[PDB]
Write an enzyme that holds these catalytic residues in place. Sequence first.
Site, PDB file in Angstrom:
ATOM      1  N   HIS B  27       0.772  -1.228   0.000  1.00  0.00           N
ATOM      2  CA  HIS B  27       0.000   0.000   0.000  1.00  0.00           C
ATOM      3  C   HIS B  27       0.819   1.304   0.000  1.00  0.00           C
ATOM      4  CE1 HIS B  27       0.353  -0.227   4.440  1.00  0.00           C
ATOM      5  NE2 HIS B  27      -0.022   1.038   4.466  1.00  0.00           N
ATOM      6  N   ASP B  49      -0.622  -7.572   1.583  1.00  0.00           N
ATOM      7  CA  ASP B  49      -0.311  -6.134   1.589  1.00  0.00           C
ATOM      8  C   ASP B  49       1.201  -5.995   1.633  1.00  0.00           C
ATOM      9  OD1 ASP B  49      -0.021  -3.312   1.950  1.00  0.00           O
ATOM     10  OD2 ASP B  49      -1.222  -3.198   3.774  1.00  0.00           O
ATOM     11  N   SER B 101       4.325   2.488   8.459  1.00  0.00           N
ATOM     12  CA  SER B 101       4.290   1.183   7.836  1.00  0.00           C
ATOM     13  C   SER B 101       5.687   0.659   7.571  1.00  0.00           C
ATOM     14  CB  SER B 101       3.506   1.246   6.540  1.00  0.00           C
ATOM     15  OG  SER B 101       2.125   1.174   6.814  1.00  0.00           O
TER      16      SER B 101
END
EC number: 3.4.21.90
Lengths: 149, 149
Positions: B27, B49, B101
Amino acid sequence: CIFEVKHEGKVTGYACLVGDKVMKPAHVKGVIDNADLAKLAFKKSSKYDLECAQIPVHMRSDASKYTHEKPEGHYNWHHGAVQYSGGRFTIPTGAGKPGDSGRPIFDNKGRVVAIVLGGANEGSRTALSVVTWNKDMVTRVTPEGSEEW
Amino acid sequence: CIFEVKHEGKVTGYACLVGDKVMKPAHVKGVIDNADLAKLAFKKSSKYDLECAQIPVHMRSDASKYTHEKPEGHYNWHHGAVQYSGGRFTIPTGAGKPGDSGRPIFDNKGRVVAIVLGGANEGSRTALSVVTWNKDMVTRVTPEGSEEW
């Protein structure tokens, strides 16, 4: 390992069975709420703020393991996390209130890394006053401004 | 292991070198701010992901180690502790904001236990959305109400 040290119906602290000895922070008022444990021969050190007694055979099964291996990182305790860095333990101010003495701070494998005696509130973090090991040796680390829990 | 993934001068996330692969949460917008890493062949899984790429020989020295061994307890991350219990990771709401992230959650021995992708704020604690291992596999654990960081 944790056994509560009551005083006139009021729980004032705790007592862990670490290895072959039953430990209890000397400063704590009261007697251990375990018949067999109360009846033992306690030796008291004012230097370490401790008061240990060698565990009976029948309780050795419930005896926890301890360790000197304490790398920088995070540890576990009753009230969550304990940051450990700079040979110092810390918990977010407010997690530990008085009455939290004798509680162990352990690693993810169960081994008891130290035992809380009290703590110095220094803002968001409180630097814990502890009893820790040292290549088979019981040391005591205590910060300026420390209260006794 | 952590390498930041920039997007038009704005750091949008990170990329860790775990074992023999270079991982990066799919992402995340942008490219890795390391010349050599950007030039690699990236395979992308929307299921996990993730978007990994097998590490070049000269960078394998800086490659971190990973592990499935994740016992209940406390872990380390950039923003302090991470409670781990019930096959669930959690951090105190507010430690992890977007842009976090690709950061690893590791144990006290360095091993990378999981990689953050985002998190579901559920009061005082946010239950982290992660990429974790599982006896030679890469699983993905994600809570309801999860945002992407």
